[PDB]
């Protein structure tokens, strides 16, 4: 029941820098009789299984880059990133395989922080079909921006929302908008607007329309 501990919780890096990962352990994964540390590192690109990065706490798994090195021993281990690319935007984890149960850490999210980008919006009325079942829901779409720190919007009695995790390609984010409603209450008003407020957007960015039925 060995307890793994990864720190810190979040992070922020930029392409080229160095990265230090910290696995604390509740016991020694080092066994006097083969001088071996029973420890391994993982990278799990979002939406995928993890991959075995590092094992015996130091040995690179084959096809692991050189820009990855594993060090440390016994109870306090460390993952080395020489040059952070963005193909490395993910989480990272450590496990032990000394005894059962096999144990993982709390992981560490490196949120890349590259450049403030400009959020592309797009606003979408309910469909000529959705109305026909009962219900309706405008949608607006923020796409290809940094930072993840931008909220958005006048009666707001019940919406939903959804973020992407950072694009592994352009270091962006993107947002959904489930502006759900009653069908007939959607006619009780005419003028329909979403609006953004970024870090580079003092004067916000808007997309709007009128109910195409007046």
């Amino acid at each position: 029941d060995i307890v793994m501990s990864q720190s810190p919780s979040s992070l922020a890096v930029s392409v080229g820098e160095k990265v230090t990962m910290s696995c604390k352990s509740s016991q020694s994964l080092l066994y006097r009789g083969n001088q071996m540390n029973y420890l391994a590192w993982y990278q799990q690109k979002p939406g995928q299984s993890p991959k075995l990065l590092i094992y015996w706490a130091s040995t690179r798994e084959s096809g692991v880059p050189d820009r990855f090195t594993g060090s440390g021993s016994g109870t306090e281990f460390t993952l080395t990133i020489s040059s952070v690319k963005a193909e490395d935007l993910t989480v990272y984890y450590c496990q032990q395989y000394y005894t059962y149960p096999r144990t993982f850490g709390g992981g560490t999210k490196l949120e890349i922080k590259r450049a403030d980008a400009a959020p592309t919006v797009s606003i979408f009325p309910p469909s000529s079909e959705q109305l026909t079942s009962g219900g309706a829901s405008v949608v607006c779409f923020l796409n290809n921006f940094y930072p993840k720190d931008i909220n958005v919007k006048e009666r707001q009695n019940g919406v939903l929302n959804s973020w992407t995790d950072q694009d592994s390609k352009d270091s962006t984010y993107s947002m959904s908008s489930t502006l759900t409603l009653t069908k007939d209450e959607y006619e009780r008003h005419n003028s329909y607007t979403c609006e953004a407020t970024h870090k580079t957007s003092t004067s916000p960015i808007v997309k709007s329309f009128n109910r195409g039925e007046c």
Binding site: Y100, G107, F141, T178
Partner: protein, 218 residues
């Protein structure tokens, strides 16, 4: 060249029972000793069971008794049988193969099959097409589908970039899930663009063609 494919996940009500199936090709199957790992909704990874080159099984305490791990070298398949599911057990299930002709290290990994345990009812999804001079965008909406997951593709998957599919969102047992796609104005409706969607185990498979909203009132 080492492939691990899970099978048979999905939904059970509590106290239910699921037999998962991991199907391996591309190596001497009996030579390695395999395992299973699950990933909590809170994204936290948990070891589950392991089965030695010689059928010595090994389970994490939380599942002892319920879950039985079992390998058939003949057909290169591994099973996790999961009886008496607790609400905890809702997670993503990966088999793993051994690193080498050695212990249970998680060398290789299947893609993961999901096990959702509510009591709730299997419901197929609706599809509602988002239709609206540089570049236009159009989207596809899936209001109300359970259990999770579903697969959204654009033009039977031919559409690569410009998609930003969003994580589902459960509210009141129905997952809501959007997706965005962008092409030059010169492209749509010049060339037909369809939302393709599958929901497993409702055994439904839907395609809703994106068409323009036309002016027709009365």
């Amino acid at each position: 060249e080492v492939q691990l494919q899970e099978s048979g996940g999905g939904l059970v009500k509590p106290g239910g029972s699921l037999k998962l199936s991991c199907a391996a090709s591309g190596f001497t199957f009996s030579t390695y000793a395999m395992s299973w790992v699950r990933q909590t909704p809170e994204k936290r990874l948990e070891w589950v069971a392991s089965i030695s080159t010689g059928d010595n099984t090994y389970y994490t305490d939380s599942v002892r008794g319920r879950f039985t791990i079992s390998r058939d070298n003949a057909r290169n398949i591994l099973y996790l049988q999961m009886s008496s599911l607790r609400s905890e057990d809702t997670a993503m299930y990966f088999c793993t193969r051994g690193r080498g002709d050695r212990g249970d290290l998680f060398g290789y990994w299947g893609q993961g099959t999901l096990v959702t345990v509510s009591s709730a009812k299997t419901t197929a999804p609706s599809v509602y097409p988002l239709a609206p001079g540089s570049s236009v965008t159009l989207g596809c909406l899936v209001k109300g589908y359970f259990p999770e997951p579903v697969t959204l593709t654009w033009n039977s998957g031919s559409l690569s970039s410009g998609v930003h599919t969003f994580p589902a969102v459960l509210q009141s047992d129905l997952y809501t899930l959007s997706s965005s796609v962008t092409v030059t104005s010169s492209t749509w409706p010049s060339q037909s663009i369809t939302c393709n969607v599958a929901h497993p185990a409702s055994s439904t498979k839907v395609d809703k063609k994106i068409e323009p909203r036309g002016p027709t009132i009365k």
